[PDB]
Amino acid sequence: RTFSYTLEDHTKQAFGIMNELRLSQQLCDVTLQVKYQDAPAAQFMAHKVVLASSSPVFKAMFTNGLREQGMEVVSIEGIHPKVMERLIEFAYTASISMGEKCVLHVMNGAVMYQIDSVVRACADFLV
Amino acid sequence: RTFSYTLEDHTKQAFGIMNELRLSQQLCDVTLQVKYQDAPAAQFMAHKVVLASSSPVFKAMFTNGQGMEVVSIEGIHPKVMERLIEFAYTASISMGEKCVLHVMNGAVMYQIDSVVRACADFLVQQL
Numbered sequence: 001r002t003f004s005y006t007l008e009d010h011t012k013q014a015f016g017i018m019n020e021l022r023l024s025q026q027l028c029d030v031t032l033q034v035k036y037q038d039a040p041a042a043q044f045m046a047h048k049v050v051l052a053s054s055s056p057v058f059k060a061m062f063t064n065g066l067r068e069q070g071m072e073v074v075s076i077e078g079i080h081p082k083v084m085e086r087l088i089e090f091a092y093t094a095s096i097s098m099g100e101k102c103v104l105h106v107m108n109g110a111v112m113y114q115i116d117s118v119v120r121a122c123a124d125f126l127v
Numbered sequence: 128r129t130f131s132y133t134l135e136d137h138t139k140q141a142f143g144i145m146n147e148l149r150l151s152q153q154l155c156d157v158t159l160q161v162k163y164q165d166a167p168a169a170q171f172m173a174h175k176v177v178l179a180s181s182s183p184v185f186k187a188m189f190t191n192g193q194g195m196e197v198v199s200i201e202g203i204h205p206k207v208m209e210r211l212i213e214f215a216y217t218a219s220i221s222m223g224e225k226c227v228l229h230v231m232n233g234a235v236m237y238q239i240d241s242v243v244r245a246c247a248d249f250l251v252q253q254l
């Protein structure tokens with residue numbers, strides 16, 4: 001015989017504690033310090049492989065070129081730090097929430113990182 | 128207003144992506160050297176944050192006292208460790224009726240309860 005088993009919500013629960021390691025700052029190999037014009041500078045430590053799984057350009061930033069081992073500090077410009085936080089959380093919890101006055105900026109931030117499931121969610125909200 | 132959105136198929140897609148990354152040895156920080164009793168020694172590369180997301184033992188291992196790490200693994204077979212690692216990235220596992228005990232023992236070593244309870248429920252069928 002051949003017995004097979006598939007835990008359905010495993011990916012839901014596995015992502016649940018990958019978010020714990022991000023908040024507890026464990027196993028992190030990238031630090032996204034993002035500074036925006038007329039905005040307080042911020043820092044978000046995350047995991048390269050889990051951000052690569054949610055964004056093709058996050059995947060491209062970390063897979064090619066000469067990357068720093070251990071932990072790589074990445075300077076990011078162009079998006080507000082309060083928008084990058086919305087994107088990183090979506091990459092860890094598969095959900096995103098905000099007010100009606102920021103869905104435009106979050107859409108532009110999600111287009112740059114090609115998180116297409118968010119650019120279509122922000123588009124369906126504005127219709 | 129308040130915008131909210133949850134992509135349901137996200138965690139399934141993201142795991143399929145970082146499964147492609149482990150099959151191409153990108154963004155990996157582990158080399159699991161499996162040394163069993165007179166078995167052909169095999170090696171498996173994976174991510175600390177992914178193995179920690181599916182195994183409490185792997186979480187306690189990688190979160191203690193950086194960079195790339197090579198860990199020796201003994202007491203487990205390469206093919207049952209390979210099946211456990213594939214479960215971490217695919218949430219699925221498949222064995223033969225003659226290998227259900229050697230995988231339940233491998234899963235009980237790393238406290239992957241979902242695989243343990245499934246294999247233990249298989250043995251009570253023929254009992």
Ligand SMILES: *[C@H](CC(=O)OC)C(=O)OC
Nearest residue numbers: 080082097098099102105
């Ligand atoms: C928007 C802030 C936000 O999205 O809160 C969830 C913003 O930064 O204004 C430009």
Ligand SMILES: *[C@H](CC(=O)OC)C(=O)OC
Nearest residue numbers: 204206207222223226229
């Ligand atoms: C081998 C099953 C086994 O008993 O190894 C511990 C196997 O099915 O490989 C796919």
